[PDB]
RNA sequence: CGCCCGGGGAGACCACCCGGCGCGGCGCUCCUGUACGGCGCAGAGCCCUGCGAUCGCCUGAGGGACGCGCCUGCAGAGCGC
RNA sequence: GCAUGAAUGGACCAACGAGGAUCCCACUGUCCCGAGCCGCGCCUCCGCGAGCCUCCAGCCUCGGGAACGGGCGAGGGCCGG
RNA sequence: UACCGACCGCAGCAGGACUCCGGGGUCAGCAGCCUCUAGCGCGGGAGCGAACGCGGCUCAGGGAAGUCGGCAAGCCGGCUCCGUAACCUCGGGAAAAGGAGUGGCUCUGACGGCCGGGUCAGAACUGGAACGGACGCGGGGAUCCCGACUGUUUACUAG
């Protein structure tokens, strides 16, 4: 029953318990943890880690935004909202 | 008060009770009545359904829209490979009925049969016919008591068995099933013919005859547990009704205060015991003959095999008909031949100009192989 | 039977009893071999951009 | 004057009809509609020794199968009565 | 005009209305006339486990009778679970 | 001064119960759909694939003939351009009615500043005669009665 080891790990490395992650060889040696010091140490010798954020790759919307400079995905198939919704007349009245 | 419109029961109450048929398979209620002085011969044959097709025939109908051209019509194909006589039984006509005399055995029987005999072949004691078949070594005794049944019988019939191992099927015992012998003379002429074709085969070919009408007998298909809708053809209720709308509205009046047996009800569908009557004979022949469906229309030899197979039966052996129209039952199910007791008078005669021979397993376009191969730059 | 006929819009041989037929408003008789042809032509779809049809076959040359 | 067990053409459970079952392959048939990749003086054009949606050829191809025919594999006849 | 009628307001009325009513176009299983399919329940199993109701009982036809009987008189049927 | 929607509804009850912080993509949008961060698998499981029910889907030809009654379901729907009647309290009616287009790819022009930004317009080519391809999102018209209109009402059968 690993709760307290998790909670304190969650802790002491600053992030959600969901990203606290355990080596399933050295589980005794986690288990006779209970305090903060214990878990340093533990963590100091790689027993226990986290994991980077999984971070969503922009790849698909860069390109998509480079085509769409170039001209493309703008028809009138593309396009709902009406035209003073996307391009007030007021803005342009103001900059002329 | 009274119902106000008019309009008929629904369903026929001459077929009750609507249970899963008791009987083994289709049997033979009644045979055709027996007339002195007409040839000897047999009045029935057992059979698997195999498949259905198209024909294209030629019409001769003096009166009628379709008497000089041609028509399409449905056939239905039966697998009959020969039945082995084994055992002659007598009846006597007495007051209280139709009552056997004696049956006797042949000496040898065929495994087959022995096995219909049993229910485990492997593991049961093999003890019957044991001591009869010493005795029946020599002709004395099979004589004696066809003397017996010369002297004290009215009705004659034989009895023939299957031979599942010239069939697709997967049984290995056989079917046992009791032929009249009608025709001849007298009792005796009766007797000496049936005892002249024992422990021999008996082909369909010496049966019926094309162009003559039968009767089929077999086992529906089955459905099991069913509503009112479906198992009676009742109408359906208004959308509006609160918990469903398939059911009967009402199932009687506040007097008798009883459920008639008269009111369609839920329970099982199919697996019934009927009887169609009065299809005629298009064809008998064997699948041994490459020429079987060939006509005066056609080029390259086309047998009853169709293009990729009889779709859930297995290729077809030997020795066949083909009948006009449907038959009860699905394929594989063993069905019934016998000569009709009141047949349609004004049929005009058989005429076939071609039978279609193409893959039934989807939509085939092919009537051989070799066309398709030569189509396809194979 | 030595009497079939071409389907219209795949150009392959239908056998007796084997499809429908319809007449069009001028006069004109299509044969259709299956379910799948006529649906084809009543969607206008071009039988020259079908691949397994003789009209696609013909303008590839894999048919003379 | 047997069942248990397995499979259906049988089926709510049962029963019924049949059994040295079946799994996994190979061939036939037929469903879709011509695979990925490679190669093209193909390709509207362009900021062009490269980018490019598409098109042609290998390719009635590739993928799939609950129907039919075989077995070159593995297997399949055991407890209560 | 059984028995309309003038701030117990009379007549009319554009806009508005989850208000009452008639018809036309389009649309459709509302219907002719039903068929096939998907998921959950139902059904079989392991675990868990109630309410309502209850003179006694639980097959019919006719008779008479508090004038429409399960029991009474006379007949017809029905192993038990 | 811990902690909790651990509060009230007879309960560890699909009800009720005030406020603060608020990422990315598609988009007019804090709508619908998918998602990073954070949190987490909740009155238990297995088999089978009958009737019948509850919640959904498709359906030839016809098209309200059904029914007290078009109830239920279906049709329409984003954006751009074209075109819009009688009547009227002259403000409306009006999205009246009714038509056409919309994807992908390769290009051209227009609008600022002493490199930035998106939007709008036009052309060639090319895909099963296909493009608001999921989602989201008016069916319309001709009349009569009543009340001018926005608003309120019988908590638990009458809006
Ligand atoms: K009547
Ligand atoms: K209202
Ligand atoms: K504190
Ligand atoms: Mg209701
Ligand atoms: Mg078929
Ligand atoms: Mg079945
Ligand atoms: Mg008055
Ligand atoms: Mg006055
Ligand atoms: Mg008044
Ligand atoms: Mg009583
Ligand atoms: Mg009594
Ligand atoms: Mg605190
Ligand atoms: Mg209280
Ligand atoms: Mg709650
Ligand atoms: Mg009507
Ligand atoms: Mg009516
Ligand atoms: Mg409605
Ligand atoms: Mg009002
Ligand atoms: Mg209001
Ligand atoms: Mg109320
Ligand atoms: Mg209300
Ligand atoms: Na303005
Ligand atoms: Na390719
Ligand atoms: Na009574
Ligand atoms: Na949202």
């Known amino acids: 029953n690993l709760r307290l080891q998790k909670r ?71 396009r709902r909202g009406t035209r003073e919704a996307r391009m007030p007349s007021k803005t342009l009245w103001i900059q002329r | 008060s009274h119902r106000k419109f008019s ?47 198209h024909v294209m025939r030629f019409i001769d109908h003096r009166g009628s829209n379709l008497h000089n051209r041609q028509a399409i019509d449905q056939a239905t194909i039966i697998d009959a490979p020969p039945m082995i006589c084994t055992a002659i039984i007598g009846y006597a006509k007495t007051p209280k009925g139709l009552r056997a005399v004696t049956t006797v055995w042949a000496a040898h029987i065929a495994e087959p049969a022995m096995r219909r005999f049993y229910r485990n072949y492997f593991h049961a004691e093999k003890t019957a016919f044991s001591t009869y078949m010493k005795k029946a070594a020599d002709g004395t005794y099979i004589k004696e008591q066809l003397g017996r049944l010369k002297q004290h019988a009215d009705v004659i019939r034989i009895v023939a068995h299957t031979q599942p191992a010239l069939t697709p099927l997967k049984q290995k015992k056989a079917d046992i099933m009791e032929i009249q012998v009608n025709g001849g003379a007298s009792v005796a002429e009766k007797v000496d013919y049936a005892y002249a074709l024992m422990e021999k085969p008996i082909s369909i070919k010496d049966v019926f005859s094309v162009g003559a009408q039968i009767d089929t007998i077999s086992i529906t298909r089955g459905r099991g547990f069913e509503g009112v809708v479906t198992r009676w053809g009742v109408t359906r209720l208004p959308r509006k009704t609160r918990r469903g709308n398939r059911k009967v509205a009402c199932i009687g009046a506040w007097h008798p205060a009883n459920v008639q047996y008269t009111v369609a009800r839920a329970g099982q569908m ?109 | 039977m030595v009497t079939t006929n071409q389907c219209s819009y795949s150009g392959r041989k239908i056998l007796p009893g084997y499809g429908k037929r319809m007449s069009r408003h001028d006069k004109v008789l299509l044969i259709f071999l299956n379910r799948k042809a006529s649906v084809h032509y009543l969607n206008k779809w071009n039988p020259r951009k079908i691949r397994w049809t003789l009209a696609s076959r013909r303008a590839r040359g894999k048919e003379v």
């Open chain 2, 270 to 378: 199919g697996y019934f015991h009927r009887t169609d009557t009065n299809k005629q004979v298009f064809m008998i022949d064997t699948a041994e003959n490459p020429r079987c469906c060939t006509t005066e229309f056609d080029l390259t030899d086309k047998s009853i095999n169709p293009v990729g197979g009889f779709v859930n039966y297995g290729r077809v052996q030997g020795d066949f008909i083909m009948i006009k129209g449907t038959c009860p039952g699905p394929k594989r199910r063993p069905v019934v031949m016998r000569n009709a007791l009141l047949p349609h008078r004004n049929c005009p005669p058989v005429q076939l100009q071609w039978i279609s021979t193409a893959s039934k397993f989807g939509h085939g376009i092919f009537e051989t192989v070799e066309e398709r191969r030569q189509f396809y730059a194979k």
């Open chain 1, 8 to 78: 304190l790990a969650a802790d002491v490395l600053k992030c959600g318990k969901r990203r606290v992650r355990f080596n399933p060889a050295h589980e005794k040696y986690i288990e006779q943890a209970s305090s903060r010091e214990a878990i340093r140490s533990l963590i100091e010798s790689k027993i226990i880690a986290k994991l980077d954020i999984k971070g969503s790759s922009r790849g698909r919307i860069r390109a998509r935004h480079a085509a769409k400079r170039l001209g493309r995905h703008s028809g009138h198939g593309k």
């Open chain 2, 7 to 53: 309009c008929c029961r629904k369903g026929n109450l001459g077929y009750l009770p609507r249970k899963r048929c008791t009987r083994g398979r289709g049997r033979c209620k009644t045979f055709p009545p027996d007339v002195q002085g007409a040839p000897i011969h047999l009045t029935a044959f057992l059979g698997y359904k195999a498949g259905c097709t």
